[PDB]
Amino acid sequence: AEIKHYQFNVVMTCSGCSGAVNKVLTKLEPDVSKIDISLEKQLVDVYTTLPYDFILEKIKKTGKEVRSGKQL
Amino acid sequence: AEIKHYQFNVVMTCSGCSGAVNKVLTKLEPDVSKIDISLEKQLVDVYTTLPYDFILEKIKKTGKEVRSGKQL
Ligand SMILES: [Cu+]
């Protein structure tokens, strides 16, 4: 029942970039995450019960550059 | 082994899109070669010993829409 909030600074330079990241993150099994992406700010907010390493790994496996992440 | 030539029409709208595709494909070396990505024509052209479905799924992990693929 603990929700973790992670925020990632991901290099997304078009709505194709942000849309791709959304597609992969919203398709994650099990369905235990809410995903909010701001193209303008280059931010991916993930609210989830999954660990930080796992979510980070899922984003890196898209090929997108992840400049930083953190737990809020 | 049989080296096949695959070409994919991938919806890549910026260099962030194509760079990501390139990064996931270059991870399959040395089982893929001649990675040729055209942002302009939205084409990804590779030589590989891997099955088509494997390469297709690997490209799809970027989150990009793959409109079509062919064997040349
Ligand atoms: Cu893009």
Coordinates of N, CA, C and O and ligand atoms in Angstrom, one line a residue:
Chain A
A1 N 0.8 -1.2 0.0 CA 0.0 0.0 0.0 C 0.8 1.3 0.0 O 0.2 2.4 -0.2
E2 N 2.1 1.2 0.2 CA 3.0 2.4 0.1 C 3.1 2.8 -1.4 O 3.6 2.0 -2.2
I3 N 2.8 4.0 -1.8 CA 3.1 4.5 -3.1 C 4.4 5.2 -3.1 O 4.6 6.2 -2.3
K4 N 5.3 4.8 -4.0 CA 6.6 5.6 -4.2 C 6.4 6.5 -5.4 O 5.8 6.2 -6.4
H5 N 6.9 7.7 -5.2 CA 7.0 8.6 -6.3 C 8.4 8.8 -6.8 O 9.3 9.3 -6.1
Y6 N 8.7 8.4 -8.0 CA 9.9 8.6 -8.7 C 9.8 9.6 -9.8 O 8.7 9.6 -10.5
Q7 N 10.8 10.4 -10.0 CA 10.8 11.4 -11.1 C 12.1 11.2 -11.8 O 13.2 11.1 -11.3
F8 N 12.0 11.1 -13.2 CA 13.1 11.0 -14.1 C 13.2 12.1 -15.0 O 12.2 12.6 -15.6
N9 N 14.4 12.6 -15.2 CA 14.7 13.6 -16.3 C 15.2 12.8 -17.5 O 16.2 12.1 -17.5
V10 N 14.3 12.7 -18.5 CA 14.5 11.9 -19.7 C 14.6 12.8 -20.9 O 13.7 13.7 -21.0
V11 N 15.6 12.6 -21.8 CA 15.7 13.4 -23.0 C 14.6 13.0 -24.0 O 14.6 12.0 -24.6
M12 N 13.5 13.8 -24.0 CA 12.4 13.6 -25.0 C 12.2 14.9 -25.8 O 11.9 16.0 -25.2
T13 N 12.4 14.8 -27.1 CA 12.5 16.1 -27.9 C 11.3 16.2 -28.9 O 11.3 17.2 -29.7
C14 N 10.4 15.3 -28.8 CA 9.2 15.4 -29.6 C 8.1 14.7 -28.9 O 8.4 13.9 -27.9
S15 N 6.8 14.8 -29.3 CA 5.7 14.1 -28.7 C 5.8 12.6 -29.1 O 5.2 11.8 -28.4
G16 N 6.6 12.2 -30.1 CA 6.9 10.8 -30.4 C 7.8 10.2 -29.3 O 7.6 9.0 -29.0
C17 N 8.7 11.0 -28.8 CA 9.6 10.6 -27.7 C 8.8 10.4 -26.4 O 8.8 9.3 -25.8
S18 N 8.0 11.4 -26.0 CA 7.2 11.3 -24.8 C 6.1 10.2 -24.9 O 5.8 9.5 -24.0
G19 N 5.5 10.1 -26.1 CA 4.5 9.1 -26.4 C 5.0 7.7 -26.4 O 4.3 6.8 -25.8
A20 N 6.2 7.5 -26.9 CA 6.9 6.2 -26.8 C 7.1 5.8 -25.3 O 6.9 4.6 -24.9
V21 N 7.6 6.7 -24.5 CA 7.9 6.5 -23.1 C 6.6 6.2 -22.4 O 6.5 5.2 -21.6
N22 N 5.5 6.9 -22.6 CA 4.2 6.6 -22.1 C 3.7 5.2 -22.4 O 3.3 4.5 -21.6
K23 N 3.8 4.9 -23.7 CA 3.4 3.6 -24.2 C 4.0 2.5 -23.5 O 3.4 1.5 -23.0
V24 N 5.4 2.5 -23.3 CA 6.0 1.4 -22.6 C 5.7 1.4 -21.1 O 5.4 0.3 -20.6
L25 N 5.6 2.5 -20.5 CA 5.4 2.6 -19.0 C 4.0 2.3 -18.7 O 3.7 1.7 -17.6
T26 N 3.0 2.6 -19.5 CA 1.6 2.3 -19.2 C 1.3 0.9 -19.5 O 0.4 0.3 -18.9
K27 N 2.1 0.2 -20.4 CA 2.0 -1.2 -20.6 C 2.7 -2.2 -19.7 O 2.6 -3.4 -19.8
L28 N 3.5 -1.6 -18.7 CA 4.1 -2.4 -17.7 C 3.2 -3.3 -16.9 O 2.2 -2.9 -16.4
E29 N 3.6 -4.6 -16.8 CA 2.9 -5.6 -15.9 C 3.8 -5.8 -14.7 O 5.0 -5.7 -14.8
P30 N 3.2 -6.0 -13.5 CA 1.8 -5.8 -13.2 C 1.4 -4.4 -13.3 O 2.3 -3.5 -13.2
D31 N 0.1 -4.1 -13.4 CA -0.5 -2.8 -13.4 C -0.5 -2.2 -12.0 O -1.5 -2.4 -11.3
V32 N 0.6 -1.6 -11.7 CA 0.8 -1.1 -10.3 C 1.4 0.3 -10.4 O 2.0 0.8 -9.4
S33 N 1.2 1.1 -11.5 CA 1.8 2.3 -11.7 C 0.9 3.3 -12.3 O 0.1 3.0 -13.2
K34 N 1.0 4.6 -11.9 CA 0.4 5.7 -12.6 C 1.6 6.6 -13.2 O 2.6 6.9 -12.5
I35 N 1.5 6.9 -14.5 CA 2.6 7.6 -15.2 C 2.1 9.0 -15.6 O 1.0 9.1 -16.2
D36 N 2.9 10.0 -15.3 CA 2.6 11.3 -15.7 C 3.9 11.9 -16.4 O 4.9 12.0 -15.7
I37 N 3.8 12.3 -17.7 CA 4.9 12.7 -18.4 C 4.7 14.2 -18.9 O 3.7 14.5 -19.4
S38 N 5.7 15.0 -18.7 CA 5.7 16.4 -19.2 C 6.8 16.5 -20.2 O 7.9 16.6 -19.9
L39 N 6.4 16.5 -21.5 CA 7.3 16.8 -22.6 C 8.1 18.1 -22.4 O 9.3 18.1 -22.6
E40 N 7.3 19.1 -22.0 CA 7.9 20.5 -21.9 C 9.0 20.5 -20.9 O 10.1 21.0 -21.2
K41 N 8.8 19.9 -19.8 CA 9.8 19.8 -18.7 C 10.8 18.7 -18.8 O 11.7 18.6 -18.0
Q42 N 10.6 17.7 -19.7 CA 11.4 16.5 -19.9 C 11.3 15.7 -18.6 O 12.4 15.2 -18.2
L43 N 10.2 15.5 -18.1 CA 10.0 14.8 -16.8 C 9.0 13.7 -16.9 O 8.0 13.8 -17.6
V44 N 9.4 12.5 -16.3 CA 8.5 11.4 -16.2 C 8.3 11.2 -14.7 O 9.3 11.0 -13.9
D45 N 7.1 11.4 -14.2 CA 6.7 11.0 -12.8 C 6.1 9.7 -12.8 O 5.1 9.5 -13.6
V46 N 6.6 8.8 -12.0 CA 6.0 7.5 -11.8 C 5.6 7.3 -10.4 O 6.4 7.5 -9.4
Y47 N 4.3 7.0 -10.2 CA 3.8 6.6 -8.9 C 3.5 5.2 -9.0 O 2.8 4.7 -9.9
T48 N 4.1 4.4 -8.1 CA 4.1 2.9 -8.2 C 4.5 2.3 -6.9 O 5.0 2.9 -5.9
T49 N 4.2 1.0 -6.8 CA 4.7 0.1 -5.7 C 6.0 -0.7 -6.1 O 6.6 -1.4 -5.3
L50 N 6.4 -0.5 -7.4 CA 7.6 -1.2 -7.9 C 8.9 -0.4 -7.4 O 8.8 0.7 -7.1
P51 N 10.0 -1.2 -7.3 CA 11.3 -0.5 -6.9 C 11.8 0.5 -8.0 O 11.5 0.3 -9.2
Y52 N 12.6 1.4 -7.5 CA 13.2 2.4 -8.4 C 14.0 1.8 -9.5 O 13.9 2.3 -10.7
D53 N 14.9 0.9 -9.2 CA 15.8 0.2 -10.2 C 15.1 -0.4 -11.3 O 15.5 -0.3 -12.5
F54 N 13.9 -1.0 -11.0 CA 13.1 -1.7 -12.0 C 12.5 -0.7 -13.0 O 12.5 -1.0 -14.2
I55 N 11.9 0.4 -12.5 CA 11.3 1.4 -13.3 C 12.4 2.0 -14.2 O 12.3 2.2 -15.3
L56 N 13.5 2.4 -13.5 CA 14.6 3.0 -14.3 C 15.1 2.1 -15.4 O 15.3 2.6 -16.5
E57 N 15.3 0.8 -15.1 CA 15.7 -0.2 -16.1 C 14.7 -0.2 -17.3 O 15.1 -0.2 -18.4
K58 N 13.4 -0.2 -17.0 CA 12.3 -0.1 -18.1 C 12.5 1.1 -19.0 O 12.3 1.0 -20.2
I59 N 12.8 2.3 -18.4 CA 12.9 3.5 -19.2 C 14.2 3.4 -20.0 O 14.2 3.7 -21.2
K60 N 15.4 2.9 -19.4 CA 16.6 2.8 -20.2 C 16.5 1.8 -21.3 O 17.1 2.1 -22.4
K61 N 15.7 0.8 -21.2 CA 15.5 -0.2 -22.2 C 14.7 0.3 -23.4 O 14.6 -0.4 -24.4
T62 N 14.2 1.6 -23.3 CA 13.6 2.2 -24.5 C 14.6 2.8 -25.4 O 14.3 3.2 -26.5
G63 N 15.9 2.9 -25.0 CA 16.9 3.6 -25.7 C 17.0 5.1 -25.4 O 17.9 5.8 -25.9
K64 N 16.1 5.7 -24.6 CA 16.1 7.1 -24.3 C 17.2 7.3 -23.3 O 17.4 6.5 -22.4
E65 N 17.9 8.5 -23.4 CA 18.8 8.9 -22.4 C 18.1 9.4 -21.1 O 17.2 10.2 -21.2
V66 N 18.5 8.8 -20.0 CA 18.0 9.2 -18.7 C 19.1 9.9 -18.1 O 20.1 9.4 -17.7
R67 N 18.9 11.2 -17.9 CA 19.9 12.1 -17.3 C 20.0 12.0 -15.8 O 21.1 12.1 -15.2
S68 N 18.8 11.8 -15.1 CA 18.8 11.6 -13.7 C 17.5 11.0 -13.2 O 16.5 11.1 -14.0
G69 N 17.4 10.5 -12.1 CA 16.2 10.1 -11.4 C 16.3 10.3 -9.9 O 17.4 10.5 -9.4
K70 N 15.2 10.3 -9.2 CA 15.1 10.4 -7.8 C 13.8 9.9 -7.2 O 12.8 9.9 -7.9
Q71 N 13.9 9.6 -5.9 CA 12.7 9.2 -5.2 C 12.2 10.5 -4.4 O 13.0 11.1 -3.7
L72 N 11.0 10.9 -4.6 CA 10.4 12.1 -3.8 C 9.7 11.7 -2.6 O 9.1 10.6 -2.4
Chain B
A1 N 26.0 -19.0 -41.1 CA 24.5 -18.7 -40.9 C 23.9 -17.8 -42.0 O 24.6 -17.1 -42.7
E2 N 22.6 -17.9 -42.1 CA 21.9 -17.1 -43.0 C 21.8 -15.7 -42.5 O 21.3 -15.5 -41.3
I3 N 22.3 -14.7 -43.2 CA 22.2 -13.3 -42.9 C 21.0 -12.8 -43.7 O 21.0 -12.9 -44.9
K4 N 20.1 -12.2 -43.0 CA 18.9 -11.6 -43.7 C 19.0 -10.1 -43.6 O 19.7 -9.6 -42.8
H5 N 18.3 -9.5 -44.5 CA 18.2 -8.1 -44.7 C 16.8 -7.7 -44.4 O 15.9 -8.1 -45.2
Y6 N 16.6 -7.0 -43.3 CA 15.3 -6.5 -42.9 C 15.2 -5.0 -43.0 O 16.2 -4.3 -42.7
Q7 N 14.1 -4.5 -43.5 CA 13.8 -3.0 -43.4 C 12.5 -2.8 -42.7 O 11.5 -3.5 -43.0
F8 N 12.5 -1.8 -41.9 CA 11.3 -1.4 -41.1 C 10.9 0.0 -41.3 O 11.8 0.9 -41.3
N9 N 9.6 0.3 -41.5 CA 9.1 1.6 -41.5 C 8.7 1.9 -40.0 O 7.7 1.4 -39.5
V10 N 9.5 2.8 -39.3 CA 9.3 3.1 -37.9 C 9.0 4.6 -37.8 O 9.7 5.4 -38.4
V11 N 8.0 4.9 -37.0 CA 7.6 6.3 -36.8 C 8.5 7.0 -35.8 O 8.5 6.8 -34.6
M12 N 9.5 7.6 -36.4 CA 10.6 8.4 -35.7 C 10.4 9.8 -36.2 O 10.6 10.0 -37.4
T13 N 10.2 10.7 -35.3 CA 9.9 12.1 -35.8 C 11.1 13.0 -35.4 O 11.2 14.1 -36.1
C14 N 11.9 12.7 -34.5 CA 13.1 13.5 -34.2 C 14.3 12.6 -33.9 O 14.2 11.4 -33.8
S15 N 15.5 13.3 -33.9 CA 16.7 12.6 -33.6 C 16.8 11.8 -32.3 O 17.5 10.8 -32.1
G16 N 15.9 12.2 -31.3 CA 15.7 11.5 -30.1 C 15.0 10.2 -30.3 O 15.3 9.2 -29.6
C17 N 14.1 10.1 -31.3 CA 13.4 8.9 -31.7 C 14.4 8.0 -32.4 O 14.6 6.8 -32.0
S18 N 15.1 8.4 -33.5 CA 16.1 7.6 -34.2 C 17.3 7.2 -33.4 O 17.8 6.0 -33.5
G19 N 17.8 8.1 -32.5 CA 18.9 7.7 -31.6 C 18.6 6.6 -30.7 O 19.4 5.7 -30.4
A20 N 17.3 6.6 -30.2 CA 16.9 5.5 -29.3 C 16.8 4.1 -30.0 O 17.2 3.1 -29.5
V21 N 16.3 4.2 -31.2 CA 16.2 3.0 -32.1 C 17.7 2.4 -32.3 O 17.9 1.2 -32.1
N22 N 18.6 3.3 -32.7 CA 20.0 3.0 -32.9 C 20.6 2.3 -31.7 O 21.2 1.3 -31.8
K23 N 20.3 2.9 -30.5 CA 20.9 2.4 -29.3 C 20.4 1.0 -28.9 O 21.2 0.2 -28.6
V24 N 19.1 0.7 -29.1 CA 18.6 -0.6 -28.8 C 19.2 -1.6 -29.8 O 19.5 -2.8 -29.5
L25 N 19.3 -1.3 -31.1 CA 19.8 -2.1 -32.1 C 21.3 -2.4 -32.0 O 21.7 -3.5 -32.1
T26 N 22.1 -1.4 -31.6 CA 23.5 -1.6 -31.4 C 23.9 -2.5 -30.3 O 24.9 -3.2 -30.3
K27 N 23.0 -2.6 -29.3 CA 23.0 -3.7 -28.2 C 23.0 -5.1 -28.7 O 23.4 -6.0 -28.1
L28 N 22.4 -5.3 -29.9 CA 22.3 -6.7 -30.5 C 23.6 -7.1 -31.3 O 23.7 -8.2 -31.8
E29 N 24.6 -6.2 -31.4 CA 25.8 -6.5 -32.1 C 26.5 -7.7 -31.3 O 26.3 -7.7 -30.0
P30 N 27.2 -8.6 -31.9 CA 27.5 -8.6 -33.3 C 26.5 -9.4 -34.2 O 26.8 -9.8 -35.3
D31 N 25.3 -9.7 -33.6 CA 24.3 -10.5 -34.4 C 23.5 -9.6 -35.3 O 22.6 -10.1 -36.1
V32 N 23.7 -8.3 -35.3 CA 23.2 -7.4 -36.3 C 24.3 -6.6 -36.8 O 25.3 -6.4 -36.1
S33 N 24.2 -6.1 -38.0 CA 25.2 -5.3 -38.7 C 24.6 -4.3 -39.7 O 23.4 -4.4 -40.0
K34 N 25.5 -3.5 -40.2 CA 25.0 -2.4 -41.1 C 23.7 -1.7 -40.6 O 22.7 -1.7 -41.3
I35 N 23.7 -1.2 -39.4 CA 22.5 -0.5 -38.9 C 22.5 0.8 -39.6 O 23.3 1.7 -39.5
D36 N 21.4 0.9 -40.4 CA 21.2 2.1 -41.2 C 19.8 2.7 -40.9 O 18.8 2.1 -41.2
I37 N 19.9 3.9 -40.2 CA 18.6 4.5 -39.8 C 18.5 5.8 -40.5 O 19.4 6.7 -40.4
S38 N 17.4 6.0 -41.2 CA 17.1 7.2 -41.9 C 15.9 7.9 -41.2 O 14.7 7.5 -41.3
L39 N 16.2 9.0 -40.4 CA 15.2 9.8 -39.8 C 14.3 10.4 -40.9 O 13.1 10.4 -40.8
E40 N 14.9 10.9 -42.0 CA 14.2 11.5 -43.1 C 13.1 10.6 -43.7 O 12.0 11.0 -43.8
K41 N 13.5 9.3 -44.0 CA 12.6 8.4 -44.7 C 11.9 7.5 -43.6 O 11.1 6.6 -44.0
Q42 N 12.2 7.6 -42.3 CA 11.6 6.8 -41.3 C 11.7 5.3 -41.6 O 10.8 4.5 -41.5
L43 N 13.0 5.0 -41.9 CA 13.4 3.6 -42.2 C 14.5 3.2 -41.3 O 15.4 4.0 -41.0
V44 N 14.5 1.9 -41.0 CA 15.5 1.2 -40.2 C 15.8 0.0 -41.1 O 14.9 -0.8 -41.4
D45 N 17.1 -0.2 -41.4 CA 17.6 -1.2 -42.4 C 18.7 -1.9 -41.7 O 19.7 -1.2 -41.3
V46 N 18.6 -3.2 -41.5 CA 19.7 -4.0 -40.8 C 20.0 -5.3 -41.5 O 19.1 -5.9 -42.2
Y47 N 21.2 -5.7 -41.4 CA 21.6 -7.1 -41.6 C 21.6 -7.9 -40.3 O 22.1 -7.3 -39.3
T48 N 21.1 -9.1 -40.3 CA 21.1 -9.9 -39.0 C 21.0 -11.4 -39.3 O 20.5 -11.8 -40.3
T49 N 21.5 -12.1 -38.3 CA 21.2 -13.6 -38.2 C 20.0 -13.9 -37.3 O 19.6 -15.1 -37.2
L50 N 19.5 -12.9 -36.7 CA 18.3 -13.1 -35.8 C 17.0 -13.2 -36.5 O 16.9 -12.7 -37.6
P51 N 16.0 -13.9 -36.0 CA 14.7 -14.0 -36.6 C 14.0 -12.6 -36.7 O 14.2 -11.8 -35.8
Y52 N 13.3 -12.4 -37.7 CA 12.5 -11.2 -37.9 C 11.7 -10.8 -36.7 O 11.8 -9.6 -36.3
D53 N 11.0 -11.7 -36.0 CA 10.2 -11.4 -34.9 C 11.0 -10.9 -33.7 O 10.5 -10.1 -32.9
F54 N 12.2 -11.5 -33.5 CA 13.1 -11.0 -32.5 C 13.5 -9.5 -32.7 O 13.4 -8.7 -31.8
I55 N 13.9 -9.2 -33.9 CA 14.3 -7.8 -34.2 C 13.1 -6.9 -34.1 O 13.2 -5.8 -33.5
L56 N 12.0 -7.3 -34.6 CA 10.7 -6.6 -34.5 C 10.4 -6.2 -33.0 O 10.1 -5.1 -32.7
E57 N 10.4 -7.3 -32.2 CA 10.1 -7.0 -30.8 C 11.1 -6.1 -30.1 O 10.7 -5.2 -29.3
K58 N 12.4 -6.3 -30.4 CA 13.4 -5.4 -29.9 C 13.2 -3.9 -30.3 O 13.3 -3.0 -29.5
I59 N 12.8 -3.7 -31.6 CA 12.5 -2.3 -32.0 C 11.3 -1.8 -31.2 O 11.3 -0.6 -30.8
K60 N 10.3 -2.7 -31.1 CA 9.1 -2.2 -30.4 C 9.3 -1.9 -28.9 O 8.5 -1.2 -28.4
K61 N 10.4 -2.3 -28.3 CA 10.7 -1.9 -26.9 C 11.0 -0.4 -26.8 O 11.0 0.1 -25.7
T62 N 11.4 0.2 -27.9 CA 11.6 1.7 -27.9 C 10.2 2.4 -27.6 O 10.2 3.6 -27.3
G63 N 9.1 1.7 -27.9 CA 7.8 2.4 -27.8 C 7.4 3.0 -29.1 O 6.3 3.5 -29.2
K64 N 8.3 2.9 -30.1 CA 7.9 3.5 -31.4 C 7.0 2.6 -32.2 O 6.9 1.4 -32.0
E65 N 6.1 3.3 -32.9 CA 5.2 2.6 -33.8 C 5.9 2.1 -35.0 O 6.6 2.9 -35.7
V66 N 5.8 0.8 -35.3 CA 6.4 0.2 -36.4 C 5.2 -0.1 -37.4 O 4.4 -0.9 -37.1
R67 N 5.2 0.7 -38.5 CA 4.1 0.6 -39.5 C 4.2 -0.7 -40.3 O 3.2 -1.3 -40.5
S68 N 5.4 -1.1 -40.6 CA 5.6 -2.2 -41.5 C 7.1 -2.7 -41.5 O 8.0 -2.0 -41.0
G69 N 7.3 -3.9 -42.0 CA 8.6 -4.5 -42.1 C 8.7 -5.3 -43.4 O 7.6 -5.8 -43.8
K70 N 9.9 -5.5 -43.9 CA 10.1 -6.4 -45.0 C 11.4 -7.1 -45.0 O 12.4 -6.6 -44.4
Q71 N 11.4 -8.2 -45.7 CA 12.6 -9.0 -45.9 C 13.1 -8.7 -47.4 O 12.3 -8.9 -48.3
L72 N 14.3 -8.3 -47.5 CA 14.9 -7.9 -48.8 C 15.8 -9.0 -49.3 O 16.1 -10.0 -48.7
Ligands
CU1 CU 11.3 12.3 -30.8

